[PDB]
From Swiss-Prot:
Residues of the full protein shown: 44 to 67 of 917
Domain of life: Eukaryota
Miscellaneous information on this protein: Present with 1900 molecules/cell in log phase SD medium.
Record's function text: Component of the pheromone signal transduction pathway. It mediates pheromone signals acting between STE20 and STE11. It is absolutely required for pheromone-induced transcription of FUS1. May play a role in cell-cycle arrest in response to pheromone.
This protein's name: Protein STE5
Protein family (similarity comment): To yeast FAR1.
Gene (name only): STE5
Naturally occurring in which organism (per UniProt): Saccharomyces cerevisiae (strain ATCC 204508 / S288c)
Coiled coil: none
Length: 24
């Protein structure tokens, strides 16, 4: 299922977090 298939989604939700570190 998507549970273990999220391996592909682990990019938009992982890099989207950088929006908090980009605040410098």
């Amino acid at each position: 299922p998507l549970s273990r298939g999220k391996k592909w989604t682990e990019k938009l939700a992982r890099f989207q977090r950088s929006s908090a570190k980009k605040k410098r």
